[PDB]
Amino acid sequence: MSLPGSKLEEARRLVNEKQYNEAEQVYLSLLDKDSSQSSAAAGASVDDKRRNEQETSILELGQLYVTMGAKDKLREFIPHSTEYMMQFAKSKTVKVLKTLIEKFEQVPDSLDDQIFVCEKSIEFAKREKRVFLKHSLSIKLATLHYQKKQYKDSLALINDLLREFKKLDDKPSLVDVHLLESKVYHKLRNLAKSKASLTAARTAANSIYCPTQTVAE
Amino acid sequence: LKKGEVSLGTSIMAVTFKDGVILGADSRTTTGAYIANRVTDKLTRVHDKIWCCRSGSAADTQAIADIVQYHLELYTSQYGTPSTETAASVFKELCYENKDNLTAGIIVAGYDDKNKGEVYTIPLGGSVHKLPYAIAGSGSTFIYGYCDKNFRENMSKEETVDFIKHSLSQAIKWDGSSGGVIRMVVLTAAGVERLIFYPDEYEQL
Amino acid sequence: AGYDRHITIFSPEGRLYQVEYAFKATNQTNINSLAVRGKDCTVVISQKKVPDKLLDPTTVSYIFCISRTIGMVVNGPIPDARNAALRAKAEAAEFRYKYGYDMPCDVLAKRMANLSQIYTQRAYMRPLGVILTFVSVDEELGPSIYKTDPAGYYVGYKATATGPKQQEITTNLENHFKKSKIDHINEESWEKVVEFAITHMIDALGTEFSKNDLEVGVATKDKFFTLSAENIEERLVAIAEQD
Amino acid sequence: SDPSSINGGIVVAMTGKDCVAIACDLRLGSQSLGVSNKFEKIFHYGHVFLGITGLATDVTTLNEMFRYKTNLYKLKEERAIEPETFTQLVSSSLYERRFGPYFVGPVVAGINSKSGKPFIAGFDLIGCIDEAKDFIVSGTASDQLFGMCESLYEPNLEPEDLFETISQALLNAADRDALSGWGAVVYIIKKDEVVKRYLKMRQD
Amino acid sequence: RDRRERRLIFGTIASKMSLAPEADLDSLIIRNDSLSGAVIAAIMQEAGLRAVRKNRYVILQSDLEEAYATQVKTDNTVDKFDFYK
Amino acid sequence: GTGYDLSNSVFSPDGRNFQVEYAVKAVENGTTSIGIKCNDGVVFAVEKLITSKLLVPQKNVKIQVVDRHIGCVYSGLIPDGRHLVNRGREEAASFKKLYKTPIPIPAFADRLGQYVQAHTLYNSVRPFGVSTIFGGVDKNGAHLYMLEPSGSYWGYKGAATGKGRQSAKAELEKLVDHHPEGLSAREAVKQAAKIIYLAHEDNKEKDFELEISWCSLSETNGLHKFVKGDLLQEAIDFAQKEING
Amino acid sequence: GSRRYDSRTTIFSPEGRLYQVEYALESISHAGTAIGIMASDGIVLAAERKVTSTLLEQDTSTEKLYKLNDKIAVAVAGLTADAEILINTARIHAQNYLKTYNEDIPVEILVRRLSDIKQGYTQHGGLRPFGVSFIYAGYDDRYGYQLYTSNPSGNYTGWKAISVGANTSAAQTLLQMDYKDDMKVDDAIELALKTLSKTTDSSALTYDRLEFATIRKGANDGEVYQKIFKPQEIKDILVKTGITK
Amino acid sequence: TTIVGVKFNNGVVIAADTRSTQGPIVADKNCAKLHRISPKIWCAGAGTAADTEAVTQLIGSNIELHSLYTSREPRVVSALQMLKQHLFKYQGHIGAYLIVAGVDPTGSHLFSIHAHGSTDVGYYLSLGSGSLAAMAVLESHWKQDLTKEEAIKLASDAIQAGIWNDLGSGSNVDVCVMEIGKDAEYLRNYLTPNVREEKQKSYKFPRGTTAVLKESIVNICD
Amino acid sequence: MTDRYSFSLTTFSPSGKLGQIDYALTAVKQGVTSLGIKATNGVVIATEKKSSSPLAMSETLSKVSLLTPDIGAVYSGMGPDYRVLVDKSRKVAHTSYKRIYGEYPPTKLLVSEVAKIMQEATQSGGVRPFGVSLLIAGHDEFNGFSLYQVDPSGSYFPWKATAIGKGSVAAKTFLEKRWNDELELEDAIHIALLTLKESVEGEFNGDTIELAIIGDENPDLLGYTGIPTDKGPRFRKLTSQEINDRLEAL
């Protein structure tokens, strides 16, 4: 009712309790309702505190569209919310997008779903230029080309990154691009250039601290 | 008294009952013919319990009397509240050098647990004195002799309010420079009370 | 030449020798205190030592009344303690003269610190190394404690103390503030809050006292008072009945 | 009456469409006895003019005080100044000394160099703030020009049409007053260049 | 010593000691910077002796923070780091 | 050198500069002057050491009584003690000017401590090297405050200075158990001569002279009196009555 | 204290001169090299910068070289903050001249007036002067162009080619033998660029470390024109003069 | 000069005409008599409008600097003693009746300022030459528990009574609404009681009706 | 009677610089790390707040104050040395063109007048200099945004992206590596977090790291619905939660 968390946590358990459609109609009604603060992420209501709860509702859409195979509709939901994330504080733009892929890459999805929405961030990168977010998505974009078994497009993205890495450091992102580059040259039967990729990755590992998931791989 | 400031005094008075003192005044603000402020309340607060009437210069009682509050916090805040004569003597000093420019009389009636309701009245000349009760102002000219005849020493609560209300009623009706509603204040050990009287009350007595 | 024992110049270590001796020993008085904040009120407790039979306990105090809502906590040399006290009381009345409201914590703490920072500019006049802590209860924001350091450092403090045992009481209070995730004490009934702060004080000391051996005061809403000899003794006896 | 009115003369200023018209007379003297036929009230530094009306003690001598802080603005900022910005220094200088204030109301007229919006300014001798979109004048004969441009000026007039309006109103206003007359010079304020045109009027 | 280096020694000597699962050094790991192996080796000493005084078998998280005062800062004269106070 | 002797504008590790410590030795080398705080009033004591028969008794009085309601006495250096007297009596005259009331003892104490703390801040200003003992009667009751040469002052039921400061106050605590509030202060006047007589054992050189200037809560009620005539020799003979030799 | 730590460096030192003037020459040596040149068609004024980085932004570009008037410029060698006090101070005295005679002031009037400002600190007041050396460049209707150079000691001498900062005697030697009575704007710049390359330890000469503002006679008209060249125009000077690095 | 104000429960509203009259002839048809101390406090005054900014701009800027000084909110009563002691130093030789109203951390306040050193308070306040015309209307229709919409029509009709009954008022009316919860609302040209139409016969002076002697261009820069 | 010491500060050592200034940079290296950048789409002023006690609340401490709505400022080293400057700057700016004109002078010449007083503290007898260096950004009229570094001498430093404080040499090179024609407002925040936060250690939260942006004008900061002749207070500071939200984007 008044508290937006009452209609949220109750609808969160409706997934296993009844079905997907029972909990889906609740989130559609919570979109245009329960104004909070700051700017309007819905456009019919202002979202500041509910934006964290609205992200949870978007994560609940990952239980429906991704499992059933409706991601073609979810693929168009991200650019709809992209224009909304350009109104309020932009700190949530990268934070929400970072949590979308984790649920998106679990189910054995289709390559066209992520490629099309990743190009939308590339098309949006012309007006608003973000070198940190575009290169972060390019790491997972080249991973799709690894499953696509096309190494020509995956190398072109890395070559543009390695050219900028000579004048930069990007130590957390420098190990990841070399870690994925080793997967490209290994399936091509190369024991030399593939080994040189992990060689430069271990150099930056001794300077700063890389995360456990990166050091393990 | 200078140009641009409203003349204080007119109808004012205070009476010391058994233990305490009751200040009173009417509500009017006039420069020569008009009423600028009809809610006017004439009071001066140097302390929670100790109050003072607002007389003489209007600009001085809203500034110099607040300057006395400045000098009062260099003593009271360090130790404690002094007697009534201590705070009333500052009115004599600040008006002594400005006597050739700022001319303001002040009637000081305080409350204390020992000296009780002793009143210290300072005329326009800027001299401190000691009187049990005093009445001043240009609008109270009618009630001067009225309070000096039937007055009784150490009245009760309601009898003192009536003694002041019956007196202030003559200055409101029979004067054109004094009028409005009577706003009193109760000074005693029980606390500080505020009362207001309607024109239909003191008119019929 | 180069020594700060008379004049004041920048040392090769980047730290003034006067600032050192001011920060080193503030405990030459050999006294401790504590300051905590309740919900709508503020409770301060200071140790008191009376090494004579001829001393009037009502005269000796480290807590002076500034405004009606404002207390103060001072530790250091006695003659230099009243130098900042007489100035703060004179500056507290200047707020009403200029404004006519009650002195907020963000002003009185800033004025005394800025006045102490001018002493860094003036080489002839001596600064004060006395601990200055201004405690009061704000109307809008509630309780607030700002400790003014002799070098000009002042910031928000949920709790503060003096002496070498300041860090010992801080450890016990940090664990209680971490679980509750609140800076002040949400518990009402300040009469029981005074006994709550004594418990943390006994852990650092380990002994009891009399009614005149402890300087204790409570800053309430729109009022500040000082506990008398009977009010202090009542709390030291009543704390033994509970725990 | 007014000690600064012993000399006489006024400064008329108007506001057109992308143009500003401001003018004064050449008359200077003492009471009914004239002295200077070459005297010019309008002073210019930057892109904005400055008119001045009153006693030469506060006209020509204080002119060094205007350019005192103006040149410091020019030697430091090395840029232009908005008419609203320079007008505050005018008003503030008059209210520094309330007992001794200067009796010359200036006239300020110019075109904005940033947004390109014509604006006029300038105050009276006490420094009272008067800013409108039509005309701001000063002096003893300024009472005439208050009603002259009401039946003459029209919103959004060309610089040539505005030139004929301010000229015809000033020539007849000087004939009616003993403190104004003896020629009228008119300046046409444009975005960059300013055109000067001398006019002929009744001599005596 | 970085956070990755100090963590390896924490699980070394504490492997032979029975430790409660609710006790963790994350409070002392984040705040501490630029220390040596002596401070780490005494974590098993002072916190171990703290359990001896109270006759405690394991070592809780509270005793880890209580010993933090004597463990790291060895200066008993005046406070520490008087620069910015 | 160390900087504490030449400059008082620096900070000592013990909180008290060596220059301030030198002021303590100057006061202890003076003449012992005690004080009395009891229920009937506040009694002072002063002694004048006789260097030669050329000195005239009952002339030099180190007790400086501000008006009739506040007494004061100093020790050590004469000029530093009388410098505060001119300032203390000037602020008392300025007090009665503004407030037209007599000044209480606690209001008198803050004016003294402000001069000491201000002179220690400026390196060019020489601080006070003397101790101040002052008291009297106010609208409240008996109060006795002693101003140390460092500037620290607080509530004192007894005062001492000169030789055996803490030794002379030992007899004051003996009267606390006998009289809890002090009761009669008239007998304390005779006890004052006995306490000063205690310091006469080691300090005996030449003839001694004792003077007493007191004030009472009951008898005077704010007035001022002086011990003379029979009361002068009665207190002196009491101190010699215990030990005749 | 207030004496032993005061050595009175403003009076006569045992060397027979002022230490504050002698040691200020080293501060001038560490200061950027500013070489003034007075040509036939104008006055060439160049200056260096302190620690030019890649992200250092040049917009106003005036640090050690300012402009007092359209016909009069000024250059300083030393700490920039010390000069900024007297940069606008000479303008205040210049604007007072406008209030006085309502015309343009010759440079020779303001040269000696500012010399007594720093000299007055040594004369009285117990203050200290500035170690910044001044370079004056102006125009006149009698002497034509005027180029002067001051020093913290108060000396002023006319110089057609002057060099301050590091390698003072080294830069003036190359300009002395290469001097010519007839030099235009382009002739004086090519001689200054070759000299500044040997003053510092950097590689050749670039536009970022070169602070250059000069004056000519007229632009559209034939008199009264001066402009401070932007750093974008300084890069084009290297192309016009034929010297790249 | 007619200025009024109304203090309702949720805040205080003030209004001032845009017509300024200096002397027997109108000096300015369109101006702003409502000045600003802090963003939440708007001020008004009678007489010369420049005399107010010769004071308020000095104190109001300090109050805005006092906002970050206390780091909480600007205060209404902080502008009283500053304005009262300022007129006391100069002995109030400039006759003006100021009106200061705003919202402090305590609430809404409407204060009055007299010529010399005197300050008052009231629920509704009108000062200036046209005060007597507007004050009489405020005495007619009033009651307890006033709202925003009720306070607008009360203050608007008060100025209209002053515009019609006094020659020193006219042009339009600028109503400034100050709410406790929200920020201040300033509506310029809220009413249009005075509308001047175009003249009948258009008078256009043709080009060439003057006498031109010389011509030149004023120097700007090279 | 006060101020009897007329003699100046320490005279010239056998160096060529001033020893009072050389020791002043020691407190800067031992102070907080501050930086600044001009992206022309915004100005982000970020610094660190040192908390040496768990009982000290950082809500009262603000290292970035507001002299004028379009000008931000940040300091390093000694904290209270900047607090007294704010009290002096706002009073000198009051006597500055704020009273003279209808607008305050731009950041270029406004800081030069304030920094001129800092140099007077290094000269006149009896006053002593500070140990602090100030990074003062701002928005001018014709030149748009601005950034300037102020030494205790007071010479203006028209930089683009610079950093001071502890580890300034290592943190300055990182700013020189990332540059282009025109940056953005959000990019300057993420670059500062990958520089300021990763340079120091022990404070991972947003209460101990103060960040503010310039160029963003919210309609609620004006306080009036009247005619907006000017945009407004472009200075904006992130709250406690908004700073930690910037950390989750990297």
DSSP A137-187: HHHHHHHHHHHHT-HHHHHHHHHHHHHHHSS---HHHHHHHHHHHHHHHHT
DSSP F108-141: HHHHHHHHHHHHTTBTTS----S-EEEEEE-SS-
Instruction: Check F2, F31, F120, F220 and give the catalytic one.
Output: F31
Structural element, H or E, at residue E39: helix E37-41
The neighbours of chain B, by the rule of 3 or more Cβ pairs under 8 Å, are C, F, H
Torsions phi, psi of B42, nearest 5?
Answer: -100, 110
Tokens of H86: 């300022």
CB A143 within 8 A of CB A180: yes
Tokens of D43: 């002073």
Question: What is the domain range of residue D164?
Answer: 1-204
Residue whose C-alpha is closest to residue A97's, from A58, A49, A53: A58
Which of I225, I227, I235, I237 to mutate against chain H (most H CBs within 10 Å)?
I225
CB-based contacts of E55: which residues, under 8 Å, 6+ apart? none
CB-based contacts of A216: which residues, under 8 Å, 6+ apart? none
Q: How far apart are CA F219 and CA F43, in angstroms?
A: 12
Catalytic (active site) residue H2: no
Q: Can you say whether the dihedral through the CA atoms of I137, I141, I145, I146 is positive or negative?
A: negative
Give the chain E residue nearest A205 (alpha carbons): E4
Residue whose C-alpha is closest to residue D50's, from D127, D107, D90: D107
CB-based contacts of A113: which residues, under 8 Å, 6+ apart? A71, A72, A74, A75, A104
Taking the Cβ of residue D72 and every Cβ of chain I, the question of whether any pair is shorter than 8 Å is answered with: no
Resolution (A): 6.3
Residue whose C-alpha is closest to residue C65's, from C196, C230, C220: C220
Q: How far apart are CA A161 and CA A28, in angstroms?
A: 41
As for chain E, the residues directly before each break of C–N over 2.5 Å are none
CB A30 within 8 A of CB A7: yes
At D1, which amino acid appears? S
Structural element, H or E, at residue G28: helix G19-30
What CATH number did the domain enclosing D3 receive?
3.60.20.10
Torsions phi, psi of D37, nearest 5?
Answer: -90, -15
In chain D, which ranges are continuous DSSP H helix?
A: 56-59, 63-76, 83-95, 142-148, 159-176
Q: Could you tell me what percentage of chain A is helix, strand and coil, using 3-state DSSP and rounding each to the nearest 5? A: 70, 0, 30
Task: Give me the numbers of helices (H) and strands (E) for chain H, helices first please.
Answer: 5, 12
Q: How far apart are CA I164 and CA I134, in angstroms?
A: 9
Instruction: State how far residue B137 is from chain C, nearest Cα, in angstroms.
Output: 29
The structural domains of chain G, ordered by start, are 1-244 (3.60.20.10)
Give the chain C residue nearest B65 (alpha carbons): C97
Q: Where are the domains of chain B?
A: 7-205
Which of C94, C95, C101 to mutate against chain H (most H CBs within 10 Å)?
C101
Q: Could you tell me what percentage of chain E is helix, strand and coil, using 3-state DSSP and rounding each to the nearest 5? A: 50, 0, 50
Residue whose C-alpha is closest to residue I238's, from I190, I203, I206, I198: I206
Q: Closest partner residue to C153 among I10, I30, I79, by Cβ?
A: I79
Taking the Cβ of residue D74 and every Cβ of chain G, the question of whether any pair is shorter than 8 Å is answered with: no
The Cβ of residue C187 has, within 10 Å, a number of other Cβ atoms equal to: 11
3-state secondary structure of D105: strand
- The correct CATH number of H1-222 out of 3.40.50.80, 3.90.550.10, 3.60.20.10, 1.10.357.10 is 3.60.20.10
Q: How far apart are CA G132 and CA G151, in angstroms?
A: 7
In sequence order, what are the beta bridge partners of G42?
G216
Torsions phi, psi of D108, nearest 5?
Answer: -125, 120
Q: Can you say whether the dihedral through the CA atoms of H128, H134, H136, H142 is positive or negative?
A: negative
The Cβ of residue F159 has, within 10 Å, a number of other Cβ atoms equal to: 27
At G99, which amino acid appears? K
CB G28 within 8 A of CB G131: yes
Tokens of F25: 């030795």
Give the relative orientation of helices H56-70 and C105-121 as an angle to the nearest 10 degrees: 90
CB-based contacts of G100: which residues, under 8 Å, 6+ apart? none
At D197, which amino acid appears? R
In B101-152, which ranges are continuous DSSP H helix?
A: none
Residue whose C-alpha is closest to residue D179's, from D76, D13, D26, D21: D26
Q: CA torsion angle for B40, B42, B46, B52 (degrees, to 10)? A: -170
Taking the Cβ of residue C97 and every Cβ of chain H, the question of whether any pair is shorter than 8 Å is answered with: yes
Q: How far apart are CA I243 and CA C185, in angstroms?
A: 27
Taking the Cβ of residue F22 and every Cβ of chain I, the question of whether any pair is shorter than 8 Å is answered with: no
Q: How far apart are CA F117 and CA F134, in angstroms?
A: 18
Taking the Cβ of residue C123 and every Cβ of chain G, the question of whether any pair is shorter than 8 Å is answered with: no
Distances (CA, A) of B146 to B142, F129, H17: 8, 66, 51
Q: Give how many domains chain D has, as a whole number.
A: 1
The Cβ of residue F204 has, within 10 Å, a number of other Cβ atoms equal to: 9
Distances (CA, A) of I154 to A190, F79, G65, I132, I150: 60, 50, 17, 11, 5
3-state secondary structure of C193: helix
Task: Give me the numbers of helices (H) and strands (E) for chain C, helices first please.
Answer: 6, 9
Distances (CA, A) of F145 to F21, F128, F138, F157: 21, 17, 13, 8
The structural domains of chain F, ordered by start, are 2-244 (3.60.20.10)
- Does chain C reach chain E with at least 3 CB pairs under 8 Å? yes
3-state secondary structure of C25: coil
Pairing state of beta strands C42-47 and I71-74? unpaired
C111-137 burial, b if ≥16 CB within 10 A, otherwise e? bbbbbbbebbbbbbbbbbbbbbbbbbb
CB-based contacts of C72: which residues, under 8 Å, 6+ apart? C63, C64, C65, C66, C85, C88, C132, C133, C134, C135
Q: How far apart are CA B171 and CA B24, in angstroms?
A: 12
Residue whose C-alpha is closest to residue G139's, from G44, G57, G43: G43
CB contact under 8 A, C92 and B78: no
Give the distance from CA G17 to its chain's centroid.
Answer: 25
The Cβ of residue C78 has, within 10 Å, a number of other Cβ atoms equal to: 20
Residue whose C-alpha is closest to residue D45's, from D21, D11, D9, D80: D80
Q: How far apart are CA H158 and CA H156, in angstroms?
A: 5
Q: How far apart are CA C84 and CA F118, in angstroms?
A: 11
At E71, which amino acid appears? Q
CB I12 within 8 A of CB G23: yes
CB A95 within 8 A of CB I250: no
In which region does residue I175 sit, left (phi positive, over 0), alpha (psi from -120 to 50) or beta (all else)?
alpha
Give the distance from CA H199 to its chain's centroid.
Answer: 31
The structural domains of chain C, ordered by start, are 2-242 (3.60.20.10)
Taking the Cβ of residue B76 and every Cβ of chain C, the question of whether any pair is shorter than 8 Å is answered with: no
Residue with tokens 């560490």: G30
The count of residues in chain I is: 250
DSSP chain I: --------S----TTSS-HHHHTHHHHHHTS--EEEEE-SS-EEEEEE-----TTEETTS--SS-EEETTEEEE--S-HHHHHHHHHHHHHHHIIIIIHHSSSPPPHHHHHHHHHHHHHHTTTSTT----S--EEEEEE-SSS-EEEEEE-TT--EE-BSEEEESTTHHHHHHHHHHS--S---HHHHHHHHIIIIIHHS-S--SSTTEEEEEES---GGGT-B-S--SS-----EE--HHHHHHHHTT-
At A158, which amino acid appears? I
Distances (CA, A) of A178 to A102, A143, H86: 21, 12, 72
CB C146 within 8 A of CB H70: no
Q: Closest partner residue to C55 among F11, F12, F155, by Cβ?
A: F155
CATH of domain B7-205: 3.60.20.10
Structural element, H or E, at residue A56: helix A50-68
DSSP conformational letter for H41: E
In sequence order, what are the beta bridge partners of D25?
D184
| CATH class label, I1-249 | alpha beta
Q: How far apart are CA F96 and CA I5, in angstroms?
A: 38
Structural element, H or E, at residue B200: helix B199-202
CB H160 within 8 A of CB H193: yes
Taking the Cβ of residue C3 and every Cβ of chain G, the question of whether any pair is shorter than 8 Å is answered with: no
A112-145 burial, b if ≥16 CB within 10 A, otherwise e? ebbeebbeebeebeeeeebbbbebbbbbebbebb
Which of H99, H118, H126 to mutate against chain B (most B CBs within 10 Å)?
H118
Q: Closest partner residue to B70 among C65, C67, C93, by Cβ?
A: C93
Which of 2-61 (G) contact I at CB < 8 A?
A: 2, 6-7, 9, 19-20, 23-24, 26-27, 29-30, 53-60
DSSP F178-198: H-SS---SHHHHHHHHHHHHH
Residue whose C-alpha is closest to residue I55's, from B154, C178, A91: C178
CB contact under 8 A, G2 and F6: no
CB D164 within 8 A of CB H206: yes
The Cβ of residue D72 has, within 10 Å, a number of other Cβ atoms equal to: 15
The Cβ of residue C24 has, within 10 Å, a number of other Cβ atoms equal to: 17
Which chain D residues touch G95 with a CB distance below 8 Å?
A: 67-68, 71-72
Q: Where are the domains of chain I?
A: 1-249
CB-based contacts of B172: which residues, under 8 Å, 6+ apart? B11, B26, B178, B179, B180, B182, B202
- Does chain F reach chain C with at least 3 CB pairs under 8 Å? yes
DSSP conformational letter for A60: H
* Degrees, nearest 5: CA angle I64-I68-I72: 30
User: Exposed (0-12), middle (13-18) or buried (19+): which is B31, by Cβ within 10 Å?
Assistant: middle
How far apart are the two ends of chain A, measured CA to CA in Å? 47
CB I78 within 8 A of CB I28: no
Q: How far apart are CA F42 and CA F186, in angstroms?
A: 10
Q: How far apart are CA B130 and CA B134, in angstroms?
A: 9
CB contact under 8 A, C96 and B77: no
At B124, which amino acid appears? L
Q: Where are the domains of chain H?
A: 1-222
Taking the Cβ of residue C98 and every Cβ of chain H, the question of whether any pair is shorter than 8 Å is answered with: yes
CB C142 within 8 A of CB C186: no
Give the chain C residue nearest H82 (alpha carbons): C98
The Cβ of residue B55 has, within 10 Å, a number of other Cβ atoms equal to: 27
Q: How far apart are CA F237 and CA E37, in angstroms?
A: 80
The neighbours of chain D, by the rule of 3 or more Cβ pairs under 8 Å, are G, H, I
Taking the Cβ of residue A209 and every Cβ of chain E, the question of whether any pair is shorter than 8 Å is answered with: yes
Torsions phi, psi of B172, nearest 5?
Answer: -80, -45
In sequence order, what are the beta bridge partners of D187?
D22, D196
Structural element, H or E, at residue C70: strand C70-75
CB D27 within 8 A of CB D38: no
Rg (CA), chain A: 20
In chain H, which ranges are continuous DSSP H helix?
A: 49-53, 56-70, 78-89, 131-140, 148-165
Residue whose C-alpha is closest to residue F131's, from F118, F145, F110: F145
Distances (CA, A) of D134 to D120, D155, D166: 8, 8, 11
A/E interface, count of CB pairs below 8 Å: 3
Q: How far apart are CA A91 and CA A48, in angstroms?
A: 12
Tokens of B65: 């009397």
Residue whose C-alpha is closest to residue B189's, from B128, B122, B112, B126: B112
Q: How far apart are CA C103 and CA C94, in angstroms?
A: 9
Widest CA span in chain A: 64
Give the chain H residue nearest C95 (alpha carbons): H78
CB-based contacts of I56: which residues, under 8 Å, 6+ apart? C155, C156, C157, C158
Q: Can you say whether the dihedral through the CA atoms of F13, F17, F23, F29 is positive or negative?
A: positive
Residue whose C-alpha is closest to residue H83's, from H39, H46, H32, H37: H37
Pairing state of beta strands H108-113 and G156-158? unpaired
DSSP conformational letter for G69: S
3-state secondary structure of F160: coil
